[PDB]
Amino acid sequence: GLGTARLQLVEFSAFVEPPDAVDSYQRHLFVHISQHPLESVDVRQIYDKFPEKKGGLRELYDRGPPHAFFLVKFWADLNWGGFYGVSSQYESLEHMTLTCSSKVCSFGKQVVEKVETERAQLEDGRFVYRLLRSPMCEYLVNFLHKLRQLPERYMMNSVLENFTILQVVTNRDTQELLLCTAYVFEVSTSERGAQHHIYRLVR
Numbered sequence: 698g699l700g701t702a703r704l705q706l707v708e709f710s711a712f713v714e715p716p717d718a719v720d721s722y723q724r725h726l727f728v729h730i731s732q733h734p735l736e737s738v739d740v741r742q743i744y745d746k747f748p749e750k751k752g753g754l755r756e757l758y759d760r761g762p763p764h765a766f767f768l769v770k771f772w773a774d775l776n777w778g779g780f781y782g783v784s785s786q787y788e789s790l791e792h793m794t795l796t797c798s799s800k801v802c803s804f805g806k807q808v809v810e811k812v813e814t815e816r817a818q819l820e821d822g823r824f825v826y827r828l829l830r831s832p833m834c835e836y837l838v839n840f841l842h843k844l845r846q847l848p849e850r851y852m853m854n855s856v857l858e859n860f861t862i863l864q865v866v867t868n869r870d871t872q873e874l875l876l877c878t879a880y881v882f883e884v885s886t887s888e889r890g891a892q893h894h895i896y897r898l899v900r
């Protein structure tokens with residue numbers, strides 16, 4: 698699964714709860730992972746999709762460690778005053794303070810970047826890092842309304858081809874990379890829910 702033994706992604710989901718969930722609860726997952734041997738992709742294959750910059754995939758991979766670099770292909774479910782949310786959870790056996798850069802690179806050129814710091818919280822013999830029910834970016838929210846309005850699924854996948862996200866979690870105190878995940882996006886069928894495949898970035 699996703700993670701070094703130093704840090705595992707327990708769960709992550711972007712979601713919307715329809716406004717009627719206050720009465721009777723339901724939630725739409727656009728994308729979801731829950732981990733409460735993996736296949737491999739050669740890192741050079743996706744170099745193009747991301748910066749060739751400082752903070753670009755090649756540079757961070759040279760810094761290492763290579764067992765920290767992953768790819769997650771997402772098949773999003775776009776079949777849906779509401780709440781649009783993103784919630785992520787990681788587990789470690791070390792107490793560290795983490796820094797999580799998430800960069801959106803469209804056409805290989807980074808547009809937006811969020812960097813956040815989360816400190817550990819001890820639970821049942823693991824240190825858990827919790828970033829739950831964060832409100833979704835208005836960038837993403839409007840994007841998704843536009844993308845759902847697209848008439849054909851291949852049209853969504855061709856746009857989503859040109860958008861990629863690089864997530865890098867480092868230890869703030871030691872400034873050493875713990876996890877780097879590249880995300881590529883496609884759209885799932887209506888009958889098929891949100892799906893994902895995880896790969897290890899190799900050389």
Ligand SMILES: *C(#N)N1[C][C]2[C][C][C][C]([N]C3=[C][C]=[C][C]=C3C(F)(F)F)[C]2[C]1
Nearest residue numbers: 711728783799811832833834862864880
């Ligand atoms: C806005 N709001 N957000 C919160 C940001 C920080 C954490 C998640 C990030 N989005 C992200 C990161 C990695 C893989 C997929 C996604 C997705 F699909 F955009 F949520 C971002 C959005």
